[PDB]
Design a protein around this motif. Structure first.
Motif, PDB file in Angstrom:
ATOM      1  N   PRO A 126      14.035  33.156   9.790  1.00 27.70           N
ATOM      2  CA  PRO A 126      14.480  31.863  10.483  1.00 27.70           C
ATOM      3  C   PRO A 126      13.136  30.778  10.511  1.00 27.70           C
ATOM      4  CG  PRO A 126      13.832  33.498  12.334  1.00 27.70           C
ATOM      5  CD  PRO A 126      13.400  34.180  10.983  1.00 27.70           C
ATOM      6  N   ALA A 127      12.102  31.117   9.940  1.00 22.94           N
ATOM      7  CA  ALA A 127      10.981  29.930   9.743  1.00 22.94           C
ATOM      8  C   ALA A 127      11.574  28.706   9.926  1.00 22.94           C
ATOM      9  CB  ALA A 127      10.054  30.496   8.605  1.00 22.94           C
ATOM     10  N   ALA A 128      12.424  28.258   8.921  1.00 24.39           N
ATOM     11  CA  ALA A 128      12.514  26.495   9.176  1.00 24.39           C
ATOM     12  C   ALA A 128      13.252  26.174  10.253  1.00 24.39           C
ATOM     13  CB  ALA A 128      13.507  26.306   7.794  1.00 24.39           C
ATOM     14  N   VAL A 129      14.077  27.158  10.794  1.00 31.25           N
ATOM     15  CA  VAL A 129      14.833  27.015  12.073  1.00 31.25           C
ATOM     16  C   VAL A 129      13.756  26.647  13.203  1.00 31.25           C
ATOM     17  CG1 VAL A 129      16.895  27.662  13.546  1.00 31.25           C
ATOM     18  CG2 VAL A 129      16.922  28.206  11.158  1.00 31.25           C
ATOM     19  N   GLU A 130      12.992  27.811  13.046  1.00 31.83           N
ATOM     20  CA  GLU A 130      11.962  27.719  14.301  1.00 31.83           C
ATOM     21  C   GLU A 130      11.126  26.277  14.482  1.00 31.83           C
ATOM     22  OE1 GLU A 130      11.295  32.153  14.685  1.00 31.83           O
ATOM     23  OE2 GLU A 130       9.814  31.292  13.490  1.00 31.83           O
ATOM     24  N   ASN A 139      22.842  30.743  -5.194  1.00 32.76           N
ATOM     25  CA  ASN A 139      22.749  32.177  -4.737  1.00 32.76           C
ATOM     26  C   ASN A 139      21.128  32.499  -4.699  1.00 32.76           C
ATOM     27  OD1 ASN A 139      25.376  33.012  -4.126  1.00 32.76           O
ATOM     28  ND2 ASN A 139      25.743  32.768  -6.387  1.00 32.76           N
ATOM     29  N   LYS A 140      20.315  32.306  -5.682  1.00 28.42           N
ATOM     30  CA  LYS A 140      18.690  32.598  -5.591  1.00 28.42           C
ATOM     31  C   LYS A 140      18.275  32.162  -4.557  1.00 28.42           C
ATOM     32  CE  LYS A 140      15.222  34.646  -7.899  1.00 28.42           C
ATOM     33  NZ  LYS A 140      15.312  36.045  -8.250  1.00 28.42           N
ATOM     34  N   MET A 141      18.564  30.933  -4.275  1.00 28.93           N
ATOM     35  CA  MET A 141      17.885  30.227  -3.092  1.00 28.93           C
ATOM     36  C   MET A 141      18.375  30.935  -1.813  1.00 28.93           C
ATOM     37  SD  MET A 141      18.191  26.307  -4.328  1.00 28.93           S
ATOM     38  CE  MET A 141      19.917  26.076  -4.083  1.00 28.93           C
ATOM     39  N   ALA A 142      19.855  31.395  -1.856  1.00 29.62           N
ATOM     40  CA  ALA A 142      20.096  32.066  -0.576  1.00 29.62           C
ATOM     41  C   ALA A 142      19.483  33.356  -0.318  1.00 29.62           C
ATOM     42  CB  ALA A 142      21.445  32.083  -0.571  1.00 29.62           C
ATOM     43  N   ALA A 143      19.245  34.024  -1.459  1.00 31.30           N
ATOM     44  CA  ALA A 143      18.624  35.508  -1.590  1.00 31.30           C
ATOM     45  C   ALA A 143      17.055  35.100  -1.090  1.00 31.30           C
ATOM     46  CB  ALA A 143      18.398  36.007  -2.992  1.00 31.30           C
ATOM     47  N   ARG A 144      16.478  34.204  -1.625  1.00 33.00           N
ATOM     48  CA  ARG A 144      15.042  33.989  -1.060  1.00 33.00           C
ATOM     49  C   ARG A 144      14.871  33.501   0.402  1.00 33.00           C
ATOM     50  NH1 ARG A 144      13.511  31.045  -7.038  1.00 33.00           N
ATOM     51  NH2 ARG A 144      12.225  32.763  -7.589  1.00 33.00           N
ATOM     52  N   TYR A 145      15.815  32.611   0.782  1.00 33.51           N
ATOM     53  CA  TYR A 145      15.833  32.178   2.161  1.00 33.51           C
ATOM     54  C   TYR A 145      16.023  33.466   3.033  1.00 33.51           C
ATOM     55  CZ  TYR A 145      16.743  29.450   6.651  1.00 33.51           C
ATOM     56  OH  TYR A 145      16.535  28.917   7.594  1.00 33.51           O
ATOM     57  N   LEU A 146      17.030  34.107   3.052  1.00 34.41           N
ATOM     58  CA  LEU A 146      17.749  34.969   3.825  1.00 34.41           C
ATOM     59  C   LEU A 146      16.634  36.290   4.018  1.00 34.41           C
ATOM     60  CD1 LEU A 146      21.496  35.101   3.018  1.00 34.41           C
ATOM     61  CD2 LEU A 146      20.458  34.190   5.105  1.00 34.41           C
ATOM     62  N   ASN A 147      16.379  36.903   2.646  1.00 34.76           N
ATOM     63  CA  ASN A 147      15.566  37.720   2.549  1.00 34.76           C
ATOM     64  C   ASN A 147      15.882  39.245   3.287  1.00 34.76           C
ATOM     65  OD1 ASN A 147      12.873  39.270   1.561  1.00 34.76           O
ATOM     66  ND2 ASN A 147      12.447  39.041   3.953  1.00 34.76           N
ATOM     67  N   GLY A 148      17.300  39.489   3.032  1.00 31.54           N
ATOM     68  CA  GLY A 148      17.742  40.673   3.728  1.00 31.54           C
ATOM     69  C   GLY A 148      18.640  40.158   4.912  1.00 31.54           C
ATOM     70  N   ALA A 149      18.604  39.186   5.553  1.00 28.98           N
ATOM     71  CA  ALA A 149      19.265  38.590   6.726  1.00 28.98           C
ATOM     72  C   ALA A 149      20.644  38.581   6.559  1.00 28.98           C
ATOM     73  CB  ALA A 149      18.539  37.480   7.236  1.00 28.98           C
ATOM     74  N   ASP A 150      21.595  38.773   7.447  1.00 30.12           N
ATOM     75  CA  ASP A 150      23.031  38.518   7.294  1.00 30.12           C
ATOM     76  C   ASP A 150      23.174  36.936   7.019  1.00 30.12           C
ATOM     77  OD1 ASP A 150      25.764  38.110   7.970  1.00 30.12           O
ATOM     78  OD2 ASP A 150      25.586  38.927   9.948  1.00 30.12           O
ATOM     79  N   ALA A 151      23.792  36.826   5.722  1.00 28.24           N
ATOM     80  CA  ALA A 151      24.372  35.653   5.489  1.00 28.24           C
ATOM     81  C   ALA A 151      25.332  34.830   6.387  1.00 28.24           C
ATOM     82  CB  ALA A 151      24.685  35.574   3.876  1.00 28.24           C
ATOM     83  N   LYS A 152      25.966  35.519   7.289  1.00 27.62           N
ATOM     84  CA  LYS A 152      26.698  34.792   8.221  1.00 27.62           C
ATOM     85  C   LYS A 152      25.972  34.940   9.553  1.00 27.62           C
ATOM     86  CE  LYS A 152      31.171  36.543   6.278  1.00 27.62           C
ATOM     87  NZ  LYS A 152      32.304  36.996   6.507  1.00 27.62           N
ATOM     88  N   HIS A 153      24.536  34.666   9.519  1.00 30.65           N
ATOM     89  CA  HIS A 153      23.901  34.653  11.074  1.00 30.65           C
ATOM     90  C   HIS A 153      24.150  33.027  11.156  1.00 30.65           C
ATOM     91  CE1 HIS A 153      20.812  34.002  13.698  1.00 30.65           C
ATOM     92  NE2 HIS A 153      19.907  35.092  13.630  1.00 30.65           N
ATOM     93  N   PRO A 154      24.475  32.704  12.419  1.00 28.43           N
ATOM     94  CA  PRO A 154      24.758  31.436  13.119  1.00 28.43           C
ATOM     95  C   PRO A 154      23.631  30.300  12.549  1.00 28.43           C
ATOM     96  CG  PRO A 154      24.743  32.711  14.788  1.00 28.43           C
ATOM     97  CD  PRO A 154      24.677  33.915  13.555  1.00 28.43           C
ATOM     98  N   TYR A 155      22.379  30.828  12.489  1.00 29.80           N
ATOM     99  CA  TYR A 155      21.406  29.771  12.259  1.00 29.80           C
ATOM    100  C   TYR A 155      20.975  29.666  10.985  1.00 29.80           C
ATOM    101  CZ  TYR A 155      20.379  30.649  17.590  1.00 29.80           C
ATOM    102  OH  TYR A 155      20.310  30.654  19.009  1.00 29.80           O
TER     103      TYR A 155
END
Length: 294
Positions: free
Chosen positions: A114-118, A197-213
């Protein structure tokens, strides 16, 4: 369809990399930098550091003392910078008669969610600390940056920060699952998506794609301030905005969705050659100013 959008569509299709060729991240980043519109020469800029990030104050002529936009740039959470976005943001500063704070927040894959959100939360904190009143603040952003607008409000709300007067997501990517119908339904009309999808994969890095933030279409939006959501009819991310609007309504939030017929992803960014681009920016500024009167 205006002649500008037809011509712009054609140009965008010629320049696109065929579907499926994998463009390396550093190549995508540099390309995005190389094609960035130069900002109007009456826009001035002041380099600051905010929450450990480079930022710029981007001030068009006519800015009101005391008002600010936290601006969150697009780029799929993996690219974009102050440079790629300075032009469009300068026109949003012009339209809203407020200076914009343009944040170079941390990007994946070096700094995953969550770096960008922080960074966005801390930047908002920084604005309040500088003495900007929340009722004098707005938050806006495009694409990834537009979901991040919502992610920042939610996270901020949870941390007891007061809400700003308004928020304007532009073509928001608010659902990292990329399962909405419009990815099929709008794909032919969209000249701008296995790359998403590649972007999502890069951003999430294993995190829940349904994480609210990560994906604020799944967040509790209760208490958020009035929203203006801009989206193009002719875009794969149509559903993100329709569903965002419904979520906000359900959650008690004052929401206005404008689906602009014939428009593409962040058509705003093409304001120099697209009349609708200019018009949509004027509208964003109008809404920020309306919300600053209420």
């Amino acid at each position: 369809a205006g002649p500008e959008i037809v011509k712009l569509k054609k140009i965008l299709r010629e320049k696109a990399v065929p579907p499926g060729t994998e463009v390396p991240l550093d190549v995508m980043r540099k390309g995005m930098e190389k094609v960035a519109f130069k900002a109007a020469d009456d826009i001035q800029v002041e380099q600051v550091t905010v929450a450990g990030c480079a930022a710029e104050w981007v001030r068009a002529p006519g800015c009101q003392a005391g008002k600010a936009i936290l601006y969150l740039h697009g780029g799929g959470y993996v690219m974009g910078s102050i440079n790629t976005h300075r032009s469009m943001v300068g026109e949003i500063s012009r339209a809203s008669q407020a200076a914009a704070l343009l944040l170079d927040y941390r990007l994946a894959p070096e700094h995953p969610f969550p770096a960008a959100v922080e960074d966005g939360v801390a930047a908002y904190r920084w604005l309040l600390d500088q003495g900007f009143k929340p009722q004098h603040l707005s938050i806006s952003g495009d694409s990834a940056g537009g979901g991040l607008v919502l992610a920042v409000l939610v996270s901020a709300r949870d941390q007891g920060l007061p809400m700003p007067a308004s928020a304007i997501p532009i073509s928001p990517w608010a659902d990292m699952t990329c399962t909405n119908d419009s990815f099929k339904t709008r794909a032919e009309a969209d000249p701008m998506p296995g790359g998403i999808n590649k972007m999502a994969a890069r951003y999430l890095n294993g995190a829940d794609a349904k994480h609210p933030y990560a994906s604020p279409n799944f967040a509790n939006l209760k208490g958020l301030p009035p929203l203006l959501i801009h989206v193009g009819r002719d875009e794969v991310l149509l559903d993100d905005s329709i569903k965002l609007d419904a979520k906000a309504k359900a959650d008690g939030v004052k929401s206005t969705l404008e689906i602009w017929d014939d428009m593409i992803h962040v058509w705003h960014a093409f304001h120099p050659m697209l009349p609708e681009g200019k018009q949509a920016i004027v509208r964003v500024g109008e809404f920020m100013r309306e919300q600053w009167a209420a």
